[PDB]
Design a protein around this ligand. Structure first.
Ligand code: CKL
Ligand code: CKL
Ligand code: AMP
Ligand code: AMP
Ligand code: PH2
Ligand code: CA
Ligand code: CA
Ligand code: MG
Ligand code: MG
Lengths: 544, 526
């Protein structure tokens, strides 16, 4: 019992996990706490799905903050170093030569029978007599020897966090396992946990581990699982599966339309996260108000910030970059705002009226200072983290994750207008942003915290800027952020302060278009004007 | 007194209006009364001034008297007991064989169509064809006028030869008075016309006027025959037939394709004539296609000088001029002095139905905006109970169009306005916009600009509300653009033009399938 499980030969495995909660209000917090415990106790997070609000598929407070300060250390070291490839993961996808399973495997026929046996039994049990699920999948490059050991460590995580959180193993390497009548005595659980954790309870866990199925029994039966896997590993084909995850996903979607007339997408919603709350993808065009700092007037800038809030902005994007350092332009403004917002002698109940703060910077030192001082929520990196990818390390704090805008450009402001050739503009830009996302996600950044920005006017001719807008549908599956405001291409569409006026007016046309295209965020100079447009369009859509 | 259905055709694109409207007058002058018209259609298979002055007078009197019913026309539609045919009438199968015989013989090798209904004093379709061919000759493919129906008669006359003596005495019966080309042209006579059920353009026009008509020859109602052709062109040939067979409305004298452009109508609201003519020029330069002038010291004194000064300064890309009046005498003056092109009647011509008489001259037709409202400015906020808001207003406006059409105002010159903010609560104005698609078949003109409902949608204080209200209007401009509203009446022209331009640009796709092509190319690349 103690020989191959606690074997000193350290290996690198690939595991796929499903994370789920029922707590709508705290979903982000619950799930992201689990994500941290996974980085800490299991290995490295190298892929995530989007977050989903999910229809239940049963049939065929702040102690979390205090837990985070009392965690036992892992026996395995964290490494935040950027990686550009992962060999084990490539092997896992292909899906070939890894180490032999230390747990006994079953063949396909045995797996299928045992799996169906569990499901029929479960459908029957459950036919007895509510709330949405919040789901996420993750890929972990794990130092844990085997899936039973991993299940033990996962149950500990579940215990530490305690329906609040459900963590399941969907895949572990290419293994096919069905062990039926597991009992591990308490000392064996202790021994497993001690291999991985500097232990400082177990009583619960003995009861809880009844059997082990790899793949998870419900992998092919739950839409919510297939929905999450489709984001991460669509080309993947496990031995016990009739097809790739993408094919299984697509067939499920059509099976609901043809056999049931249900569009299964309608009540299973994709979620992105700007700060700490759920946003439904494509459900709201958010206004991002632009705050340019270039003079020094930190008091005037903070007044403008407050003006913008009242004018209707959900997000404030501050930037010094377009003598005195960038840091000295932005940090004092953010420090003043932070003070002035805290010294609100108004309703302390009115504290969920705070705008999300975004910083338009490519510079590590500036972002590092803002983050340490709790001055910002989002990184707006116009180089899509290519100028200094080390910034990606600052998006992960132990309990906390930050969101990030990835924008496309070529060159710098003086070389930009030259670098205009594209073989296939729309798709070049899209694939570029997709590749940039794969890199952050490979490096442990939650997929649902990443925003795509085509970068209008950045190494684009005016016709190319227009064409990217005509073809904006290309981002229908993704969180989309655009900045068209006061850019020169608008003017090029119209048939000196009159020219500045027509430009602002022309932007509001793009605000309308964005609204109808369900653009998630628009970065604008003119907040009041934009808010007024969106309000009217919203009201015309509201059927009473 | 007979009921005659005519088709009128031309192929000159530039002068289609002037060609077909002149033909309309000559029909009015020489044949009876126009009591129905269709829309103008573009379908796919000039000293008229000198002619208008030296025109021969009819043997019948022209009365512009309004009517609200026409019993003969109602009997035509039924189709009940009418006067017996004074000509050789064939039966069902005999007509069908003879019909097929002209079709197969002709099957051996842009079009602008308009149908009309005429209450005619002319005794028979053959006599009418004589007057019709004479009408065609006075105007000389330039204009072709056919007889689609004459009462309920099933007629075929196999070979016709008539002399200068016979033709002169038919043409004398109806006119006080060359016959050279006329003798050679009249070969035969078919009632109904041979191509009635065959050409799409004909069925398209007839569906405007007489959808429930069922001639003894034809196997279904004009609508059911129309609807079959539409569904068969899609199912059989995978072609949307409405793509190349476009509906036309006319604002002045030029063709406008229904639902193809959102025109800006600039508001000139008087109370100083010099300042107001400056604003008109400004508005043209900001991108207004139409100017809407309204004073409503007298209404006439506020507006007629401004229009007269404008007309002059222009003589020292012309905007279409619209007058916002319900006053008969004010419109009459403007129209006699060629100062306006359009009547904007906010009472939908119910304040004074006589105003409709002024939308016609010998050579002129003016267009009109019909707006829905209840009451006056002081009472309207109270008059907000509707059985079915959306449908009561549409039917209301449809009844009004029918009335103007019964009286010979061309169908294609009448514009619909829902009257936002007139006897509508804020939610009802919104509901009306939400349901604007109910006007997909019609020329639609709306005015939201600066009205109170815009403000109600929003979540230095009075100046802020003013600014928000102009900006909120731009959202409605955008909506109007996507919904394909034909005209929008606005205060802020530059702003609205800026918005419409950007939206037009976004919509101009150089290659209509480059979207899927580029997608495939990306999918085929490593
Ligand atoms: C030399 O003068 C010029 N000549 C021709 N075209 C020009 N381009 S432009 O006027 O259209 C223009 C204007 C402003 C910008 N940058 C503003 C930003 N735009 C964004 C941001 N962040 C995010 N995420 N997305 C953004 O779109 N941060 C700042 C870029 C292009 C131009 O200006 C540099
Ligand atoms: C004295 O009465 C009033 N009292 C309080 N608030 C009022 N404000 S309101 O915003 O609801 C509003 C504003 C303007 C109007 N009418 C302007 C016009 N509107 C049109 C037109 N012609 C056409 N064809 N279509 C038009 O919509 N001519 C003039 C109607 C309602 C108000 O109305 C004048
Ligand atoms: N791949 C798996 N991941 C998680 N739990 C599993 C798996 N295979 C079997 N189980 C068992 O399923 C039960 C967990 O159910 P739940 O409490 O709903 O997560 C426990 O008895 C586990 O031992
Ligand atoms: N119902 C009808 N209306 C008009 N013309 C007709 C009719 N029946 C036969 N025709 C003949 O068709 C000729 C005109 O043909 P077209 O102008 O080429 O369509 C006339 O001169 C008539 O002789
Ligand atoms: N949609 C959905 N349904 C479920 C889920 C879940 O995560 N999502 N988890 C279950 C057992 O924990 C039971 N049912
Ligand atoms: Ca780790
Ligand atoms: Ca007459
Ligand atoms: Mg579970
Ligand atoms: Mg003909």
């Amino acid at each position: 019992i103690q020989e191959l499980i606690l074997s000193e030969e350290n290996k690198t495995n690939i595991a796929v996990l499903n994370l789920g909660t029922n707590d709508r209000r705290n979903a982000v917090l619950i799930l992201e706490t689990a994500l941290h415990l996974v980085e800490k106790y299991l290995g490295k997070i190298i892929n995530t799905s989007y977050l989903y609000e999910t229809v239940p598929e049963y049939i065929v407070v702040n102690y979390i903050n205090e837990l985070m300060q009392n965690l036992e250390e892992s026996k395995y070291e964290e490494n935040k170093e950027l990686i550009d490839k992962c060999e084990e993961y490539e092997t896992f996808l292909k899906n070939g030569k890894v180490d032999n399973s230390i747990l006994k495997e079953v063949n396909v026929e045995n797996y299928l029978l045992e799996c169906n046996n569990i499901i029929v039994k479960n459908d029957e049990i459950m036919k007895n007599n509510t709330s949405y699920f919040y789901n996420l999948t993750v890929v972990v490059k794990t130092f844990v020897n085997d899936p039973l050991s991993m299940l033990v460590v996962i149950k500990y995580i579940e215990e530490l966090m305690k329906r609040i959180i459900d963590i399941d193993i969907l895949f572990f390497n290419d293994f096919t396992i069905f062990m039926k009548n597991i009992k591990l005595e308490k000392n064996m659980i202790y021994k497993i946990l001690s291999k991985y954790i500097h232990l400082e309870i177990i009583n619960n866990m003995v009861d809880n581990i009844e059997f082990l199925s790899i793949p998870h029994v419900y992998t092919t039966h739950r839409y919510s699982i297939l929905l999450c896997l489709n984001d991460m590993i669509p080309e993947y084909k496990h031995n016990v599966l009739n097809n790739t995850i993408r094919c299984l996903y697509n067939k499920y979607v059509s099976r609901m339309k043809e056999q049931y007339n249900i569009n299964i997408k309608e009540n299973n919603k994709r979620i992105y996260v700007l700060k700490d709350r759920i946003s439904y993808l494509k459900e709201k065009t958010n206004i991002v108000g632009i705050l340019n700092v270039n003079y020094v007037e930190p008091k005037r800038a903070v007044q403008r910030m407050f003006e913008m809030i009242n004018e209707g902005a959900s997000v404030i994007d501050i930037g010094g970059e377009s003598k005195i350092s960038e840091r000295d332009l932005v940090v004092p403004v953010l420090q003043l705002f932070q003070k002035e917002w805290n010294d609100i002698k108004n309703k302390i109940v009115k504290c969920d009226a705070k705008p999300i703060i975004s910083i338009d910077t490519i510079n590590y030192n500036v972002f590092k200072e803002c983050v340490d001082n709790d001055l910002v929520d989002i990184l707006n990196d116009i180089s899509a983290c290519t100028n200094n990818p080390e910034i990606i390390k600052l998006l992960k704090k132990k309990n906390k994750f930050y969101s990030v805008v990835l924008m496309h450009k070529r060159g710098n402001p003086h070389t930009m207008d030259k670098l205009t050739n594209y073989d296939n503009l729309v798709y070049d830009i899209k694939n570029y942003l997709e590749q940039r996302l794969n890199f952050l996600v490979l490096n442990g950044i939650p997929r649902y915290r990443i925003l795509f920005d085509i970068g209008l006017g950045f190494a684009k001719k005016h016709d190319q800027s227009i064409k990217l807008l005509q073809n904006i549908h290309v981002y229908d599956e993704y969180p989309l952020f655009i900045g068209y405001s006061r850019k020169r291409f608008i003017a090029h569409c119209m048939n000196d302060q009159l020219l500045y006026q027509k430009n602002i007016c022309g932007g509001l046309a793009i605000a309308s278009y964005s609204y109808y295209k369900k653009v998630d965020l628009i970065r604008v100079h003119d907040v009041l004007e934009t808010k007024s447009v969106l309000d009217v369009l919203t009201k015309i859509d509201q059927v009473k």
